[model samples]
Target: NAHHLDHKMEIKQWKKSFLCSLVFGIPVMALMIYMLIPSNEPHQSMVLDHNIIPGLSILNLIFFILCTFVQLLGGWYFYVQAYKSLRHRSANMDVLIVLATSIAYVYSLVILVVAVAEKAERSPVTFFDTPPMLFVFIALGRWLEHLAKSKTSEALAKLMSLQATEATVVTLGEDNLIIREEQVPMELVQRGDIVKVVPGGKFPVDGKVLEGNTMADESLITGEAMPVTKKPGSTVIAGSINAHGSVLIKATHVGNDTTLAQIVKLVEEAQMSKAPIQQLADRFSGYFVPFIIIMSTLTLVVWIVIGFIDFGVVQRYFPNPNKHISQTEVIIRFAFQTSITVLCIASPSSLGLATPTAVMVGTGVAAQNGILIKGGKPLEMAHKIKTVMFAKTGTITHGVPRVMRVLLLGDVATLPLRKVLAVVGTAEASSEHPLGVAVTKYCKEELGTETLGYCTDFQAVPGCGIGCKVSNVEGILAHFSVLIGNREWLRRNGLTISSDVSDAMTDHEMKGQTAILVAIDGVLCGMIAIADAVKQEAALAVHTLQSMGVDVVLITGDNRKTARAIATQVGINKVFAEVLPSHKVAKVQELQNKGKKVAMVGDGVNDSPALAQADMGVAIGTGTDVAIEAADVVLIRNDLLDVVASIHLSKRTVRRIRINLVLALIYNLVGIPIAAGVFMPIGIVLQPWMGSAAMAASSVSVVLSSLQLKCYKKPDLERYEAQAHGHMKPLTASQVSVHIG
Candidate 1:
């Protein structure tokens, strides 16, 4: 926002200068051109005619009066910035512009005075338009640059717009119970305050849902497409949308401590930070102004020498009326013109804007699309990520297991599949394990609530499973004891598993499924196979990364079969399985030791170590603070597709930066020589006005090229999501079988 304000101020200054040029510069230049044009009146000769004191005097005087305003008023900012640079004992683009225009203005003024005093009409023709035109062109260029620069920070502005201006605070009664709600400024809300959110309202602060159930749309903050369901005790982040229900939340993090504020701060810092490539431009700019000055002086001397050496030829080429103008006079005017041209052509402004402008636009645009590139360094490094490693849980997969296969081994009548699930679901209903929840959901969907029966005296074994006495009927089927757990847990409890049942479990485990054995008392009844489902976009995202020449590896604490099953499903071949949180770093280090630049994509919390160890760490938006802090890039949408977008954007931005730099340098390289009269031998003259225009054009070109980055559009993430969800056909060979399983 500060940068945007600065740009707005700069635009104002340029506009003021441009208007002054149009008001004063246009008239002075027009009058100067009229004086130079030949007239048919018998009494009136060209301004170049000798000894025409009265006519020339009036023209010169009027020209000086008009040009003084254009030069002094329109160019004052240039003079001030140049002076500041000089005070710091350095030179900048402003210095080059100021020096060149100043020399032209002063030289023309001196020539006018000599012509008037000597009563000579043919004074080395005054270039009254040079100074004002220089200021006008530069000002116009800067104005356009400011306009383009404004777009770079538009993303930041959009981000600030996400914050709530006002919040509905809960007004507690004397009993500290439910009361009326009052709307108050978000700034006034603090931690521990209770906030009431209604449907379609956004959460003012990060907090825990104390009451009510709702679906919050966090796409803006977390970039997650689907709305997250919230219930009592569930954590809700600030800036998330509260949809479908009303809820009371106790604020935990407010003000700057909130997630939205931190994200805004991070984005601001990224735009401000410098890339390594910028250092080259910074170092070059230090010498750019003084070097141009020396070049201008050398051009003046060289052209003057050439003119003097061939005075006769110079006179013939530029013949004056009455032969009053000497060769020395002709050469001096030509030399000064060349010097001014050289000064105007060699602009250092383009060099100065090349890096920062690209960086601002790149980072800002990235933030707009739910990708937070930390700084220039990380953005620059993203292009070099040779291997991308992803955390399996909550990243490649949905992080929640679902029942995929059901097996029945005991008598069918008493322990049928539906009845078995009823017992398992009821027992697990009181448990919080994801596997248990899946069973409950599956049974609810299949048999509904009527057949679920009841459970009593339920007991749970930590890291193992659960058991309870289930009852469904009276008399013959009055009651029975049921157990659901792992093989070791079942064995420890003296449950007998037939070889056929063991083989079935082994077969399921080999296929990357979690086998949960069911038992009635001490006999094996059946088993349910469950596995975490792959995210809809994971396969397509992996396919996209590979297409871009980036290798992907999967690493997780899950077993080899499970990890490989998920990996194969998602088209990933390299997988590091059964690695603990502490050892995740080792995998990243191993990749690094092999000379690969690894980027770790993960749920920022558990993957903090690995993320830090990799060349670039990309934290998922749903990840913890530890991971987000350690990451160089954060995917706010928690979509793996954004990882591809981030990297591609980096490469495109860096490429554009290089193009801008080279083009800027090349403009000076070619323009400076022509401006210095290098082609004067062939009757080609690069006038001061043309040089000024070219200089402005160069800076505008660099800015426009950088602005082109704002048009970047990522590969369609939605299309891939549709393909993964079986709503659409695959677009590529690898994706043809993505949704098959």
Candidate 2:
């Protein structure tokens, strides 16, 4: 049965066992609890003590049957695991559980056998309620722990569910054209196999595009808000959407070898790995069983020595007024009872759980929010962040140029605005310049129309601009020649630069915008201002970090004017502009050398060295894979808000770990001494059954403490969105201080 069975069979095995444990263990717990109620009915004693045969009372007989069933059924799992643990010369929590239950059961069985053989006049007390009730309590505690444990890794379940179940396979002919296409299960997909996917379908495997030019939605994996252009020779990751065109691909990595699988595997392993904070717990609990057994033995020895000196002291707590017993027998009974309670009261090794559970929940929460945590170390290190180096280009900014504002010139400054843009996109599309592409994107995608006019006599001059003649079916011919370029380019074409036009370009350039002049029939008509605009959430995200007392500094390869302009917009004071690509590592270490814990946030291939040099590196997931590889945290969404969320998650996670450790420590420190009867002179004694209940409560309480992070309250992002929409007033630094504090 233990042989690697199919997963469904394995699932079917535990569910029935779980119900059986509940069925067999519940009655034993219920009866034991009911017996302690101190019933006042007239026939209570008669009902409980009536003989089944001669020596066995009715209540004791019922307890005996129930405890036996619970022991064999509910305790079976503990027995096997405990045996294996001891057999391997290692002690675990199961060892403590097995010891507690077995000792009480065996001792109670001896008493029953002796009482029957001797035929005692009065019915004997049998401690048959201890084992089954203990089993039930422990089971309930484990069930609670399971609830938190599952919720901790809920994000991984979501990631696993994103995988495609099937793929449309293609058979290529000798000349590299597809011979036939057939749909097949994803499991059958192999490396070098031809796979085809349409718009809105997920790629089944990591592949190299064989024939396609499409836009792939990688938001699920990289959290990039924009769809990446995928064409021939572009490597496509598994789970990305083929959003805009049908594509044929050659599968390079399939099944568990895919990028998505790699992330899941790392996340799973990270949950199992111990954080540095758990070193003390690991060392202390490693020798827990041996030391606890010594203490239990000494408690017995000390109690017995006290009994020898004064029999009255022994009889004080375990008083039996009507029954006469020899002084020797009296000492043995109370001393032995105290010793059994000591071993039974020892709690499970829950200190071992203190860090991992909190980390698991933390990572899961981060992952769900498009933040991929590297592991416990980075997550732990984030709490200590003092300075954050933010790469401005693709991190705080949108990372792509966009049309910021359009200015109309001359007498027709406001009129014919829609008509001017109608021919612009088609003319710019013919040239592959980045600025031209931005204009094309703005006119086509943002304006909601593509190629509204066709271009004639299209001419592109490298690094300057493109000139073309546009005509449309709406009675507009090539009468107006469109010339889009900078000032010098426009002046070279015999157009004089007027002071009115010259002043507008100067004003925009000073504000860190690239102004492109548009001419119609050799007359300046419009000015298109473009820049890599900061993200909508960038300023609020910066304020959030500043409110948390973390200092933000802008790092960029841009000129001093542009970088300072961006820094001002994002509310950052410290600026390091014109830093070379490799010089980024030096800047990170400069702060690190000053004893600051720096977290570097970047999205470029050039930032890899700096990312590795910083204390904690956070890469924008939409960035180069090299940066992601070097960084400790990955923000997949192309939003600055995720940066703030990652830091907040790390702080909360460590806070949970602190509370869990303290709770686990407090339970052992207080519960063990109380169970050892340290306060017995003051008439305080923790009974064996009381010890079992406390033992079960300890682990469950620790697990619950970790689960507090599960129902997390995300940052009030809607407020910022409202602010962006002019519905709410934005917070100043002073106001932010007042709010959070």
Candidate 3:
């Protein structure tokens, strides 16, 4: 409900504050350059002693005051953010840093202002005059950190923006006529309300199609590259773009419970979960500054105490009127005694800009490209895939098994077979079984026939086929369930009991083909062959994976020879066949036992167990919902090319993470020593202020490097297409018989 709070106002205020800082920052930065006076004489304050430009000093005073406000105001957003985070019971180090810097700056400001007014003439005047440049330098680091945090968290904001501002709901008018989408109360739009979605408009809510078949490009929500065809009863996802047709959809899903809403929540969860390496970085950062500060202190004290004993007379011989050296002088003198303390007691080489930066960059890249990597652990683990296992039925092959070819037996060579095909297809017009569906698809495309509506009283024999009544098309009760392809299916079901049909089916089975029997009114008519063809694109995908050094292993519930035949056609080198639903997980375990990291790719509810057991499980978007949930990666395109894309993305992400780790080490290797006081003896000592500034800058650099992955381009897809096929075989089903049992 931040609706009333204008984001425009926040932007305007930020711009106004930045301009104010620019006006004040110039002089503040200049003064920082002039600090310590750049003189050969040490421990002596640089001043005019007699104030000539008394008003000139006033300018620095005014500028300093202005600079303090700029630092507090310009950087106040983070300060408040950190505070709220703590109030909500989650505190971060930014809160402590902001408070420390502001306290030191404001307290110093009051003292210097008082000292200036007290003495208008000659005075040393300023002790805490370390210059406002240090604060400005610190401010620069905070600015970048704030930007990174803001950008990374914008994923949810983008999702919120995707929702339509207004919705059109239809309600039954008092006259029982339909109303406009916006005219009706959102909650009142019940089932069958005709919600209209025009071209390029988001569907206000998930809906089932009532009329007008169209393509909905769901790539926005599911990462699907192709548009899905929506007809009556097909569920439409909200926020998907309507390509061309005007659709009348009935609302099925609405409000915060939609799939789009779930995706936004997934992004948030991913951002919060830390990778293993991130925990190591956390442990290091947790103690890094404290450890460095302590070691520097001890080193400074040890050297200073040693130097004092060595230079005891030297200190007593100073030009001070009172020959007294207090602990303040001793602490300052000893702490800055040697440059060796700077290099030796610095933070470790691996302690700069660690894990979160990589995760941020990885997730950010995924979002930009329409693939949301929902969690760090999933992103991190996706890189180690080796043996890519796949489910046979709905995953590797099309889930919808269509009859591509039909062979006829019994004296009717060609002309008579054509007529037989038409007669049998007419008998199967009303059946909805898989075999019937396959027969119907062939009849529509090849036979060019209309449904005769002949079949009635249809009954299915489990694991065999379907039996139905044929009035006059073939014979009444004569169209038996033709246990197509497998001999066991026919033998067990008590159909195709004739030895001649059995022998004919056996010949078809040996050749890796399917055989369907044609019967009418309990009398054998002839045999028709049916088969589910290998996908045209499968071979190329398998070859591409093999070229990438990935082993293609086929794991399926189908029989061994059939699995091997499909695998051979698709260029897959390994096959594990006849696997039951319960044995899928064990197959993955077997691959893992062979010391190979496995990635299972499947699309059925039966494939869910294998998906869960693999090192990286990828579920095809077009398949079962259960398998999609179990998969570590989901290819929404349902194309094999997306599998290659997912792998490439993982490799690039892992490389980016490695590069960030090395960069963090390289920065600390050179930066930490300089921050500790390594350059002080050579007239180049970094103050405590400079140390914090260095840390912040190093973090920003690592973040920028990590972000480079966002610009990465996908690999060439043509290369993925070149080599997926294995040995090719052209076999038709009527020539062989398959034993389904």
Candidate 4:
């Protein structure tokens, strides 16, 4: 917000300078042009031939007065900016503007003195109009560009309205009801503090409500467009409004992690981060101003030779100018006009603005659509995604799993079912694997608060399951060995599975289920069958990627049969089954070795190395923090289709940036030659004032083109969602055959 305030003041300065310069500049420009009337060309006399003194024309004296006022007042900022840039040992647009205007002003003042001293009937050509005219265009150009630039961050400005700096702190009585509440600064509200969110007030921080019911608007963060109901034990995020009722909440996450601050930080950082192409342009711009300065100086010396040394050179090639004027008069005007035109027309400002403004709008627009790209580098890389590799567990399927059936082998009543479950739950509760988590939760629901007991030193092996020493509830001591893993893992630990157990495990895997083999004390005791539910939109997402000409692949730790079943269900043709976590990275790198640009999609925890190795790392941030830290592009909506949108948005932004870069380049490429009088032989020429106007508009044109990125329309998820709600058609013979099975 302070940035907005500063920029608004900057715009005001440009506006004041532009209007003042235009006021004085227009009249001075007009009077200078009013001379050299076509009827008087034979004698080369002025329209205002009346003299104020014996030698001075009355109009020339007016030019001196008005032009000086505009130069000292309207052009002061240019000198100061040029001085500042020079102090830092840099060349900028300010430097060129100062050089061009100052030279013209100095030339005209010298001519004014010479005309009066010579006491001649014919007055010399004075260029007092060029200085003020250049200021007018330069100020106007910068004003428009700055104004357009401010609008690039408009998306984040919508979020700024809700960063509540204050909160209502509450105190509880003995009965735990709110006995006192007062508005306090946000810093005063701390962790676990009870905060009273008034009706329509934003939740001060991410918290859980213990009392009160309300509907909170969450569209600011998630783009939900509707209010989410909040009740006792309901979690509410900061920056979301308490729409209709007051809710008291205990602060869980505060200070730097309100989610609002992180979003702002990411968006702000993304906007400022330079892309590889932009850094090249930055270095090119650094050299451009000095290059223009040297070229203009070269032009100055060349024109002086053409005018003074060999007068007929100009007469032969560029014959548009007056030959009736004195040779001394022609020499000074010819050299100065060429030099000043070169200075005014050549600019690095447009090239500097090309990628920066495009990135500004591109980054904010991406956040507005729920794809949080970390920086410009990611956005640029996302466009080149030729192959997309998806991790099968949490990415292609819903991460949640369920214990569909539990099988006990070998007359497993040596220990009762209750004792067997207790041991399995004890080991699984310590494991972080999704299937392990599902087993632990189901066991607890089946036996509430009845301690299945505990486990010590739980360890997990990649591509295998978990291992630990189980302990009974009666004695907090290690009782027996519990190993839960794939069949290979249990066998490697010196356990042999019978034919009957192997048959059940193969049957479970054929149905797209993970057969979790459990063992106790080196004996093959049980097998628990769990199934992973595929995401509803998983097939559609893969289809969309294929439609965009990107190859889709699945690589995971599930058995070959189960991996094939899930891949077939998701319409993926290529898959790597029973892969280790470390092998996932190697698989991705293998594709990269074959000259493929791969975008690896994962949960971001186990698949981090693969994500880092792929050309683009896209993480699904479905209420998780690992995704934010590990991926280049984080899809906030928990939808796989955002990956598609990320690629589409990147291509669109890069296309727009290419246009801006070309325009910026063309403005200087074609513009500089004309301003330098390279086409003078064909009777085509550019005036000093024309060069000034051309330079000013080119940079503004780039900014205006970048502003078009604000209207970026996202991929139609509604269309995809509607298609996902039902099959493309009723079961055909092929689908019916599979369904009947």
Candidate 5:
């Protein structure tokens, strides 16, 4: 909330400052234009000379009054900030604006006073338009910049707005049971308190469902296309809407503890951080204001010295038509003219804004698509990722396992299939592994909804098999001791498997399936094969990454054959199989040691060390909060395509930043010399107002270039759109295999 309020205040401040300049500037500009327009009678050029002073002329008096107000009132903001910069012994864009406009105003004011005191000819010698127009144009540029920056923060604002301010807290009676629901502010809700989220209402906090069932629209947080169903024991995220049915939830995390708050906090921190590349711009800006000032002063000194040394040459270029013009006045006026122009043309705003503006827009666009790039450093580094390491489960494939095939051993083939399934299901039901649950699901589907017999003395050996004594409490199964796990796990538990069974296990594993060996009362029975199906987009994502010249490496905890099979199916050529969580970090470090820039993508928890070790870390949004916290980039959609999009976005943003910096430097290189009167001998000299316009234009151009990032479309979107329109088609599986292989 404070973030948005600060933005609002800054925008309002810029707007007011711009208005101050415009209000006084427009009339002063009009009067100057009126004085310059060709007159019917013999009139002087708009050029303010030493002889021309308006002490008595009504036009001169009015011009002086308007110019003073414009400079002191309209341009006051610049001077104020410049003074602040001075106190800190530093300089910024404001110092340049203040110095440039002050020179013109002070020089003219001195001339006006001198003419009035001397009672000389009422010469129209004034640089009144310079200060006013410079202030107005620069202010307009700043206001536009503030406006664009405000737009970039809209994504953050939207996320903040999603937080529900009110919640329906379930009231409890003396018996500690739900009595009635009462509306209350979300801030008053405590952890472990029950809250009822009605249909169409948002969840006030992250919690677990205690009653009823409903589908939740978690698109705002997870960026998923479909709604997730919530029932008892289901975890619900804060800010997600209860699509249908009222669910009573026990709040686990309230206030800033929610996921939404964490995301918002991360985004805020990212925006505040400085990217590595920005150091160049930062160093440039640190000295830019002071350097420009010194240069402007040098320009004045050189011009004065030239005027005194070569009066004839100076007089030839700057003609003193009036014999009454003093030599001192000519030298001073010539020096002041060049100095003021030099000051106006040298712009530090472009330098200061070059990198940050692009970063702001880039991060904002990323967030809009559910890809939260932590900040400038990560965004800058993302463009240079040479190798992308992917965690197999959850990243390259669906983390959920399902039974794919069933193979019966020698003597087990004689047993009825239903009986084998009942024993396997009864044994696996007590196990908590994904593979175990998969076997249970497969048996329930094959054997119908009939309940299985009770199991006793269940014991699970980590990284191995589970054993339990099955009872014939029902007619479904006979009493026996059963073991369900891998071949190695069964062998360790004193169950001998023949060479034929070992070959069968190897075949299933080679096909990327987990082969679970079943043992009944110390005798090998049958084997159930399960595999986590690859996501549809996984192959496409790998193909896209490879096409972009990025090396894709598959890293997994699965066995060598299984990992290799999965990698082949996903078009990955580099494979690291059977790697423990600790080894994942070592692998990332090994790559880094080889001078390879690696980006590790995984579920945050097991992969946190690797993610932190890599040059860049991309966390799957659906993964644990721990992983998301460690990652530099968070993909809310849990899509590999977003990783590609993020890389492209970073490259584009960095490219834009380079372009802006080059243009800004070029503007100063060419503009400063011209403003300093380098071309004056050749009858080419830039006026103060023209210098002001050039400075303003350069700043605005840099800002507009950065703004282009807002409209950037992901490269994949273009390809998909082309395919949808029949202009192109993605590669087939055979083609990808051949090409990738």
Candidate 6:
């Protein structure tokens, strides 16, 4: 998706090109009318002779042809494409465009051909002959449409660009194979196959470490800033870069089963979804194009008939003292002028520009700020997020839990930290659970050793940790105790401890620590209490979210007390604690069932399911690769402020779109009636060229309005609310305890 910025930029330039022609066309028509029409006369008949104006210059002829060419080149494509897509979906700007442009061209052609044919005094000029405004206005519309579409999908291009094109796949009993990441498949990979990943390289598949060690920059996947060290049994994310050290991992998830593919697919789907284009213009253009043509023809016929009938009924109607006004020419000229203006104002082509321009502006803004919004559908839904559900660890709290407190029991000094880690890192290598992986990661970083090599007979006890044979220690320390099981497993295994030690463990657990007891040779040696900390900005972010009318709920696998403490610290009143990875998604689903549009924010593998289930999933830049992939919106910046920024941006985008579309609709709605002879009795008939100028101006105004929104800055909730009503309270809370009653 990140790769699509170039695509969006191209679109922006394409729109600019289209807009340039519109800008030129409108004024060209305006100037031509000013020079050609004698405005001082009282409703005088039009004449191309030198008695009234200047000569028929060759330069004017060239300029007329030039404007015509630009109109067809720039606007014709839009008209044709809109009509093609509209056939199945509904009418669009294109239909109206074809009508207006063609009508103007026909009218101009009438004048051009008559002038060239040496018709001199007998030549007729009228508006009904062609649509003068269609091309100019439609081109203006397309220019704006391009801007809107680009803005909406800003993040998508960035996200897709994270994957490295090439990958290294290990082949059995052969040299390591390097292939394109897109070509790599799950079936081609199997368990126990070692895949070597170099620094700054993307993991080809979602897998666990079988060999090697390195600090993997999970930012691309989890949105986290700090890198996590990976060793045997530690899960590595697809599309994440290895920041330091070289590592080899065994394939676990690949191809479509990988998180990378899922995110790419999600973004692609979002991009392809239809956004709401200006509907009114489409509806009108569906019939307006053909209607204008027919109306122009009818105007010609009716005027011709009127002229014939009037000539016989009243002889002086033409104001001819010595000769008669040609009834046939008068009818033809008046009908031609009427038809041109009708097509110019009634054509739907320029209206097509209204909606897409809004989308592009919105998308471009998001991209600039490191937020990737897929398209209009997701962007629209993002504006309605009322409740934001968040996974505690990884999503809100940093997923990496540090050993906050380490307690040693019998013969603690003899237990080398390096040796103890080797045992733990090797044993817990097969589990995908965060705690198990944390233990292994802690060992790798603390020891600073090459990844453990060739350990055998590995077996993982789900929820209880893992068991593996560790080599290279003296015979006395050959067989080691992993000590990764639950706290109760230690008490149950006859490692008795006093109430004071038990009380200390209980205190840390309430403070959000996960306690793990390690035994060496079946003897309780020490215990490490690890705690995942709340992000420093999380509190401010939560406050900002609340100010926006969002109900913030903390959902975590951590215990109730820990959850409540973190929730209270962050000003969140609602909490769903002690939830399993499988149950977390249900919370989001339940919120939706209650008619809440929920946005799930998370950063860990555990939050992936919930992220996918939420109406809008927002992924922190520092969490799990899978979680980020599952989310609809990705905050590329690790700060929680990005979340607040995203919401503000979404709301602003929608507001801008509404404003722009309304402007476009109002222009056509009002302009069409005026052009259709509704003001004929006022002696202010619209000249065919004037109709073209006004129509072009309307389209330009709509597009420029959308462009103005591109510079919009996201509003600060506190400041916005403060200025909205100067410290006003909702309902002005009257004193319920009636004074002295």
lDDT of each: 0.74, 0.72, 0.57, 0.75, 0.74, 0.60
Report the C-alpha lDDT of model 5 over 1-741, residue by residue, as the tens digit. Answer: 657524777778888888877878888777777767766764556434323343545566666787777766776667788899889968777777777777777788788778787786664356776776777777777777677667666667777878888888886665437788788787677888878877688887888888676888877665666888878889988888878767777789888888788877877888776876688678767877778888789989997888788877777777655655677677787678888888778777787888887887787778766777887788778777889988877787778888877866637455667677776677778877777677788888877756886788898875556778887635664328877665566665565778887787788777778776777877767777778877777756766677777887877766666765776677676677655454557777777888979998877666778888887888874532622656788876667778777887888888988898899889989987788887867888877888877877777788888878778655555584453353323432233221121
Q: Residue 708's C-alpha lDDT in candidate 3?
A: 66
Tens digits of per-residue lDDT, candidate 6, 300-325, equal 56656766776453234433433222
Better of 1 and 5 by TM-score: 5
Off by over 4 Å in 5: 3-6, 39-58, 116-119, 122-124, 170-179, 192-200, 208-237, 240-250, 314-316, 326-328, 410-431, 441-496, 519-522, 621-627, 713-718, 721-741
| Per-prediction TM-score to the true structure, in the order listed | 0.80, 0.72, 0.72, 0.88, 0.86, 0.62
How many steric overlaps does candidate 5 have?
5
Residue 457 in candidate 6 has what lDDT? Answer: 56
Q: How far is candidate 2 from the true structure (C-alpha RMSD, Å)?
A: 9.2
Off by over 4 Å in 2: 1-77, 109-120, 170-180, 188-259, 313-320, 326-331, 402-509, 514-530, 621-627, 679-686, 713-716, 720-741
Clashes of each: 3, 0, 26, 0, 5, 60
Give per-residue CA lDDT, model 2, range 1-741, as digits (tens): 212211334335545555666786677667766766766775555365577665677888888998888888778898999888888976877877777777778877886776677676445666687776676666666655555456555667667778888898888787568789888887676688888887788887887888768877766665546778878998888888767767888888888787777777667766654667877678887888777778888988887788788767657766665543456755665566667777877774567787787887788776655677776788778888888888876787676798888877745644376667666767777787667788888876665753357788998766456788977625332225888776666777787878877787767876868677778777667778888767778767777777778997877764455665666677776777655564567777677888989988878465888888887877774522322567777765566788888887888898888888888778777776677777767778765777777866777677777777778765566864553454323433332211000
Every model: Cα RMSD to truth: 6.4, 9.2, 7.5, 5.1, 4.7, 10.0
Give residue 510's lDDT in candidate 2 (0 to 100): 62
| Candidate 6 global Cα RMSD | 10.0
TM-score of 3: 0.72
Using TM-score as the measure, name the better of candidate 2 and candidate 5.
5
Worst 10-residue lDDT window for candidate 3 reads: 122-131
Rank ordering of all candidates by lDDT, starting from the highest:
4, 5, 1, 2, 6, 3
